[PDB]
Amino acid sequence: PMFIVNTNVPRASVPDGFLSELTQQLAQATGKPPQYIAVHVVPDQLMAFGGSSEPCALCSLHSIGKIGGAQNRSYSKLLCGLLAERLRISPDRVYINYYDMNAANVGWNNSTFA
Amino acid sequence: PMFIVNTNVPRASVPDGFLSELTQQLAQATGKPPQYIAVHVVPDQLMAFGGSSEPCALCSLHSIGKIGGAQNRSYSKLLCGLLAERLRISPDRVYINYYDMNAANVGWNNSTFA
Amino acid sequence: PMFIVNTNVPRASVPDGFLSELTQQLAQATGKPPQYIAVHVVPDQLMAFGGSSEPCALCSLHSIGKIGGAQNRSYSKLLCGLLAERLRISPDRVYINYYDMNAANVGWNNSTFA
Ligand SMILES: O=C(O)/C(O)=C\c1ccc(O)cc1
Ligand SMILES: O=C(O)C(=O)Cc1ccc(O)cc1
Ligand SMILES: O=C(O)C(=O)Cc1ccc(O)cc1
């Protein structure tokens, strides 16, 4: 899976080890080995949420499987939780888009996962 | 809804008030309350369009509903017009990707919109 | 088509001419005239892949048509090869997400392609 966080929080406010923590927690939450987890954190962004430039985040989680109604509620609780604790972003200023990819539409290592 | 603009126009050429103007215009166009609209503008990017690095933009608009053939034409007229007037990007050097998201695939405030 | 490369390789490691080379190679690979191809390269990113911060890339290719099982395998070989040769990223540290877009969901020049 792939997890992307775009935020207007400054780079200095992102803890060291945040990328490793995300990797570990996503591995547990999705049941995927950590070897397959990619995480991308984009701070210092020009963003507004509801008209306001208070801290906010726009996120995406792409996976082959492990996406659905109930799992996505679980992931939202986990990820809003981590962003609130570590980046000090309110969970009502977070959107997370979930994408269930087909394996033929994910390239890796000169081929696809199909 | 969420609206993301990626452009090679420098940060200095992005006018004051632009993120608020986009929030207001998108609220008018989509009917959604401004409180739920998120905007993200990414200047200074390394981009080319048709082989040339003249000003250009790559955009996306995600919404739960209010996406479809006729609506998307209207959004394109609106957004290309704003980009041309405020950032001086020609409309024929803009692509906008539209995504109709299922409510169960959008996380917000520790849950999803399902 | 649109091709986006996010990577933790530094800006100075991106060779001169790379955006044009991507444009040319995607035109040949997809069969689309180069006037339609847009490319966006984002270096210097905070990223991890498999828990490691070694060079990696997260990419996406969006097209109207020309997306599918066998075509995506060919694209992956071409694009992993380019990233390996030009940015010295190992192909097993690259993910490429492929998106087949409907013409009604792509805006351009004040309308859509529908
Ligand atoms: O657009 C909406 O219905 C909404 O209120 C929020 C929203 C947020 C993110 C997204 O990708 C789609 C919709
Ligand atoms: O999670 C997996 O199974 C993967 O094969 C890895 C993967 C899934 C979805 C992506 O967009 C990127 C990588
Ligand atoms: O690929 C084509 O046919 C285009 O006309 C250009 C295009 C296709 C898909 C996109 O998401 C953006 C641009």
Mind listing the domains of chain B with CATH numbers?
1-114 (3.30.429.10)
Is B98 a pocket residue for ligand 1 (Cβ < 6 Å)? no
What is the distance between the terminal CA atoms of chain A, rounded to a whole angstrom? 15
Euclidean distance between CA atoms A73 and A70, whole angstroms? 5
What's the burial of B58, exposed, middle or buried (CB within 10 Å: 0-12/13-18/19+)?
buried
Is A4 a pocket residue for ligand 2 (Cβ < 6 Å)? no
Q: Do B40 and A6 touch (CB under 8 A)?
A: yes
Determination approach: X-ray
Chain B residues with beta carbon closer than 8 angstroms to that of A60: none
Instruction: Pinpoint the alpha helices (H) of C1-114.
Output: 18-30, 69-87
Residue C91 falls in the annotated catalytic set: no
The distance of Cα B2 from the centroid of its chain, to the nearest Å, equals: 7
CB atoms within 10 A of CB B113: 17
Q: Given CA atoms C50, C51, C52, C58 in this order, what sign does their dihedral have?
A: positive
Helix (H, G, I), strand (E, B) or coil at B23: helix
Q: Do A104 and C68 touch (CB under 8 A)?
A: yes
Edge-first strand listing for the sheet containing A106-108: A111-112, A106-108, C94-100, C57-63, C2-7, C38-42, B46-49
The size of the A-B interface in CB pairs under 8 A is: 96
Whether B3 contacts B22, CB under 8 Å = yes
Q: Do C46 and A101 touch (CB under 8 A)?
A: no
* Pairing mode, strands B111-112 and B46-49: unpaired
Distance A88 CA to ligand 3 centre (A): 38
Resolution in A: 1.8
Q: Which ligand is nearest to the CA of C98?
A: 2
Euclidean distance between CA atoms C23 and C34, whole angstroms? 6
Q: Given CA atoms B7, C23, C112, A107 in this order, what sign does their dihedral have?
A: negative
Residue B65 Cα: closest atom of ligand 1: 3
